[PDB]
Amino acid sequence: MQLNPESADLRALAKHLYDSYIKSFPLTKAKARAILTTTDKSPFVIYDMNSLMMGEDKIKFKHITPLQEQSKEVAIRISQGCQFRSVEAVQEITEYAKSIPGFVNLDLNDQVTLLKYGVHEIIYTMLASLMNKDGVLISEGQGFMTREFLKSLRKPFGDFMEPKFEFAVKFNALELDDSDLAIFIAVIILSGDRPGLLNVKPIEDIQDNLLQALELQLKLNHPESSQLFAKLLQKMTDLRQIVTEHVQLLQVIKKTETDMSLHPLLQEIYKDLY
Amino acid sequence: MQLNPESADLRALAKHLYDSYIKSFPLTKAKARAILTTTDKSPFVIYDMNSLMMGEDKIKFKHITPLQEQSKEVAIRISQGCQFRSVEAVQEITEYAKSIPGFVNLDLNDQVTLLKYGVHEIIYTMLASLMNKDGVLISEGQGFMTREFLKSLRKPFGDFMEPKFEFAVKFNALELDDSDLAIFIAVIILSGDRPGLLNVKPIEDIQDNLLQALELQLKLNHPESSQLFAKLLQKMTDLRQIVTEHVQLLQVIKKTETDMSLHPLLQEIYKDLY
Numbered sequence: 186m187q188l189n190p191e192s193a194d195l196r197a198l199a200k201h202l203y204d205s206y207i208k209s210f211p212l213t214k215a216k217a218r219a220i221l222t223t224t225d226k227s228p229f230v231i232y233d234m235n236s237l238m239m240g241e242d243k244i245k246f247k248h249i250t251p252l253q254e255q256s257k258e259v260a261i262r263i264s265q266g267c268q269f270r271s272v273e274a275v276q277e278i279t280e281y282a283k284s285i286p287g288f289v290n291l292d293l294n295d296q297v298t299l300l301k302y303g304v305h306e307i308i309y310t311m312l313a314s315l316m317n318k319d320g321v322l323i324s325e326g327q328g329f330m331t332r333e334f335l336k337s338l339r340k341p342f343g344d345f346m347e348p349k350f351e352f353a354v355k356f357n358a359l360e361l362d363d364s365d366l367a368i369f370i371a372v373i374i375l376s377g378d379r380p381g382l383l384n385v386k387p388i389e390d391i392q393d394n395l396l397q398a399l400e401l402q403l404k405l406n407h408p409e410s411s412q413l414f415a416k417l418l419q420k421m422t423d424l425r426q427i428v429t430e431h432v433q434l435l436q437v438i439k440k441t442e443t444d445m446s447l448h449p450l451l452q453e454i455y456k457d458l459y
Numbered sequence: 460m461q462l463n464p465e466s467a468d469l470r471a472l473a474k475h476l477y478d479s480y481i482k483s484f485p486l487t488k489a490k491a492r493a494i495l496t497t498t499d500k501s502p503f504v505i506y507d508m509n510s511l512m513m514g515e516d517k518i519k520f521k522h523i524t525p526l527q528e529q530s531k532e533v534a535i536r537i538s539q540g541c542q543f544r545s546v547e548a549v550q551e552i553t554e555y556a557k558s559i560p561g562f563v564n565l566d567l568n569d570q571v572t573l574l575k576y577g578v579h580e581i582i583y584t585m586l587a588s589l590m591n592k593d594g595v596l597i598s599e600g601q602g603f604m605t606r607e608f609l610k611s612l613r614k615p616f617g618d619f620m621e622p623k624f625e626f627a628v629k630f631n632a633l634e635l636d637d638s639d640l641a642i643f644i645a646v647i648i649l650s651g652d653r654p655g656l657l658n659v660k661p662i663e664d665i666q667d668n669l670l671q672a673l674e675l676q677l678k679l680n681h682p683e684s685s686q687l688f689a690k691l692l693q694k695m696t697d698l699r700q701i702v703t704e705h706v707q708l709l710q711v712i713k714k715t716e717t718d719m720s721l722h723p724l725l726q727e728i729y730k731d732l733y
């Protein structure tokens with residue numbers, strides 16, 4: 186490999202995406218890692234029902250039912266907390282996408298479709314940044330909720346987070362940093378096979394350039410990590426499977442859980458998804 | 460890039476896989492392409508219900524219902540023909556997999572799981588070899604059935620082939636040959652994320668070597684095809700979506716079609732799939 190104007194353009198694209206990533210996502214992997222080990226945040230640990238209640242400042246929730254079984258109340262509060270986070274993350278990701286060169290010039294309907302299918306895949310990708318073996322950072326790093334506490338929630342609420350943790354353990358072993366992730370998340374957004382796209386070629390033309398930039402970024406940033414580009418591309422399949430499973434759980438809740446409606450933005454995203 | 464003992468080993472692996480591919484799959488892409496343009500096969504074209512009946516030698520079927528509406532009879536005969544082909548293709552692919560170096564040494568349960576999830580993905584990959592814009596080769600190249608005839612079958616039978624054709628048009632535009640496909644299909648079989656695998660690392664260790672071989676094969680065989688490795692890896696996601704859709708259609712048939720049971724081998728493959 187040589188350092189030439191083609192490669193320098195690919196590095197400039199990588200930097201542009203990194204800079205927009207920093208602007209769009211306040212809690213980066215670097216910041217999260219600093220917390221999980223050295224920082225200005227000292228998160229309160231939620232590891233059981235008591236500590237979920239003794240630290241109610243972290244979880245946002247409201248319209249809270251005094252008279253119901255504790256196991257149910259706790260599950261519904263956690264679910265509302267994830268719903269609040271998801272709506273905020275959608276706004277971060279849509280802001281980021283606007284900085285992807287060429288994206289805002291695509292047909293508006295395709296921009297919508299690309300974000301409709303991309304956003305949850307990116308949410309779960311970036312959630313791994315906030316996860317370790319023990320648990321997940323929440324509330325902009327002010328809390329840390331354990332994996333085993335989340336697994337212990339009343340059926341079926343206890344099934345929601347475990348597939349994201351399983352993904353994160355293997356994904357975090359790739360040791361990606363924010364500079365890598367900024368490009369990877371752009372590659373996900375510019376996926377030409379989303380249902381109902383109108384003009385695939387302008388999308389794939391952008392994606393191909395992002396793939397070139399990602400390939401170079403990994404070579405430079407990960408010496409001796411064999412086939413990291415291919416291993417990372419294959420993670421895009423895992424993300425779709427996580428979405429599929431998550432949708433099926435959300436429906437179980439809809440079917441057997443009154444007094445729970447999705448935020449209208451999430452409803453819009455999920456309506457006619459696949 | 461240099462020609463050295465590491466690269467020569469990767470070419471030797473590519474050749475080993477090609478040789479086994481030739482031994483396992485009698486109707487290769489090269490042979491199919493020769494037919495679709497120059498060959499010893501002159502397929503009969505099935506383009507409408509009459510020609511489906513005027514050329515009943517091609518389609519295997521049996522236990523054939525005289526007294527029923529023609530649109531239904533034709534659909535059930537086509538469905539039985541695909542079922543016969545599928546059972547034969549499963550046997551070809553399982554034979555091939557045994558030649559993948561290291562595969563037969565994996566735990567037997569994981570060998571089963573890898574083939575359980577791999578086989579239909581490989582069937583649809585290789586079906587594209589037999590497809591052009593107009594239709595698909597059948598009965599070892601003795602027939603050619605049009606895409607529009609298959610789309611015209613009685614609802615819901617008319618929905619089955621169209622997603623495979625859509626995949627094939629875009630996949631065939633990558634211009635892969637049999638030497639490329641032999642390695643790609645091995646990469647699919649050695650996917651470490653299949654449900655219920657016991658030892659993932661020995662699988663991913665084989666897959667990583669296959670990916671190295673595939674990457675080199677594409678560089679050598681496809682000058683100026685930009686990002687072909689990444690574009691091809693992303694096709695593995697499409698294949699899973701085809702399987703998902705196909706399963707959902709098979710169930711529609713099961714629900715609203717008496718006197719149709721799957722061949723027991725396909726039943727085994729589909730049982731507890733996902």
Ligand SMILES: CN(CCOc1ccc(C[C@H](Nc2ccccc2C(=O)c2ccccc2)C(=O)O)cc1)c1ccccn1
Pocket residue numbers: 244245260263264265266267268270271308312321322323324330342343345346431447451
């Ligand atoms: C676990 N965690 C980190 C953020 O996790 C996310 C986990 C998932 C999501 C995506 C989001 N999920 C939900 C949306 C609406 C309602 C429930 C969920 C759940 O996901 C859920 C359901 C039942 C039980 C548990 C969770 C979506 O689909 O948009 C967004 C964020 C928390 C927990 C408490 C407070 C804040 N942070």
Ligand SMILES: CN(CCOc1ccc(C[C@H](Nc2ccccc2C(=O)c2ccccc2)C(=O)O)cc1)c1ccccn1
Pocket residue numbers: 518519534537538539540541542544545582586595596597598604616617619620705721725
């Ligand atoms: C179209 N074609 C090429 C082979 O195509 C395949 C298309 C699909 C398959 C996979 C296979 N499919 C079936 C299995 C059982 C019953 C029906 C199907 C159909 O796929 C089907 C159903 C309804 C209507 C039409 C098809 C599987 O799941 O194992 C294997 C082969 C034909 C057609 C007639 C005879 C032979 N070749």
